[PDB]
């Protein structure tokens, strides 16, 4: 029971990731929606910016047995694998699918080529995730992406999937015969109560 402050943009993608971690870790936090772009966490005299650095801080700093851990031990068996999927998902340029990376009309020729690149990049990441979720299925007599416990890889995936639904990508990328494990996963995430709150 410590008093954290979080300054965020309530509809931003970074904000949803950080607030989900904070809900999962069951931490008290006074939230300030400062919209009118990258989040800021204050913990007494410590001031941490950017979702990934805020989340890493929250994991290292709150070691109380009462607060759950979203990661296994750094020398544990499956830490490298969870770190791998969390970085994979966190590398997707989620803000770039709508407009690309060049907005001026005079770079349309190259913007559409960049949009192809990242959209092919997105297809492989989701394909890689769907095989991993099948491997988990083939070992269930129920587990999340990397193992039995909800994890930072699952935080990045739940929010990444929610974000892709919002942008109109879900219909062509899971359900209706396509990537059935992702559909089940997203359906399970929506019912989780920490995610529902955000």
Swiss-Prot record:
<dbReference type="GO" id="GO:0005741">
    <property type="term" value="C:mitochondrial outer membrane"/>
</dbReference>
<feature type="cross-link" description="Glycyl lysine isopeptide (Lys-Gly) (interchain with G-Cter in ubiquitin)">
    <location>
        <position position="117"/>
    </location>
</feature>
<feature type="cross-link" description="Glycyl lysine isopeptide (Lys-Gly) (interchain with G-Cter in ubiquitin); alternate">
    <location>
        <position position="113"/>
    </location>
</feature>
<feature type="cross-link" description="Glycyl lysine isopeptide (Lys-Gly) (interchain with G-Cter in ubiquitin)">
    <location>
        <position position="116"/>
    </location>
</feature>
<keyword id="KW-0812">Transmembrane</keyword>
<comment type="function">
    <text>Regulates the mitochondrial network by promoting mitochondrial fission.</text>
</comment>
<dbReference type="GO" id="GO:0032526">
    <property type="term" value="P:response to retinoic acid"/>
</dbReference>
<keyword id="KW-0175">Coiled coil</keyword>
<keyword id="KW-1133">Transmembrane helix</keyword>
<dbReference type="GO" id="GO:0005829">
    <property type="term" value="C:cytosol"/>
</dbReference>
<dbReference type="GO" id="GO:0000266">
    <property type="term" value="P:mitochondrial fission"/>
</dbReference>
<keyword id="KW-0832">Ubl conjugation</keyword>
<dbReference type="GO" id="GO:0008053">
    <property type="term" value="P:mitochondrial fusion"/>
</dbReference>
<feature type="modified residue" description="N6-acetyllysine; alternate">
    <location>
        <position position="113"/>
    </location>
</feature>
<keyword id="KW-0496">Mitochondrion</keyword>
<keyword id="KW-0007">Acetylation</keyword>
<feature type="cross-link" description="Glycyl lysine isopeptide (Lys-Gly) (interchain with G-Cter in ubiquitin)">
    <location>
        <position position="28"/>
    </location>
</feature>
<comment type="similarity">
    <text>Belongs to the GST superfamily.</text>
</comment>
<feature type="domain" description="GST N-terminal">
    <location>
        <begin position="2"/>
        <end position="66"/>
    </location>
</feature>
<keyword id="KW-0963">Cytoplasm</keyword>
<dbReference type="GO" id="GO:0071305">
    <property type="term" value="P:cellular response to vitamin D"/>
</dbReference>
<protein>
    <recommendedName>
        <fullName>Ganglioside-induced differentiation-associated protein 1</fullName>
    </recommendedName>
</protein>
<keyword id="KW-1017">Isopeptide bond</keyword>
<comment type="subunit">
    <text>Homodimer.</text>
</comment>
<keyword id="KW-0472">Membrane</keyword>
<feature type="cross-link" description="Glycyl lysine isopeptide (Lys-Gly) (interchain with G-Cter in ubiquitin)">
    <location>
        <position position="124"/>
    </location>
</feature>
<keyword id="KW-1000">Mitochondrion outer membrane</keyword>
<dbReference type="GO" id="GO:0006626">
    <property type="term" value="P:protein targeting to mitochondrion"/>
</dbReference>
């Amino acid at each position: 029971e410590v008093h954290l402050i979080l300054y965020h943009w309530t509809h931003s993608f970074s904000s949803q990731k950080v607030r989900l971690v904070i809900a999962e870790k069951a931490l008290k936090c006074e939230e300030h929606d400062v919209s009118l772009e990258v989040p800021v966490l204050v913990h007494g005299e410590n001031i941490i910016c950017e979702a990934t650095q805020i989340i890493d801080y929250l994991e290292q700093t709150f070691l109380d047995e009462r607060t759950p851990r979203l990661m296994p031990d750094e020398g544990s068996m499956y830490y490298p694998r969870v770190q791998h999927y969390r970085e994979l998902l966190d590398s997707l340029p989620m803000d770039a699918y709508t407009h690309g990376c060049i907005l001026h009309p005079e770079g349309t020729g190259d913007n559409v080529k960049y949009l192809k690149k990242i959209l092919d990049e997105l297809e492989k990441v989701l394909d890689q995730v769907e095989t991993e979720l099948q491997r988990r299925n083939e070992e269930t007599p129920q587990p999340w992406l990397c193992g039995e416990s909800f994890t930072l890889a699952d935080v990045s995936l739940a929010v990444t999937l929610h974000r892709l639904k919002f942008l109109g990508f879900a219909r062509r990328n899971w359900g209706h015969g396509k990537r059935p494990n992702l559909e089940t996963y997203y359906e399970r995430v929506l019912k989780r109560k920490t995610f529902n709150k955000v």
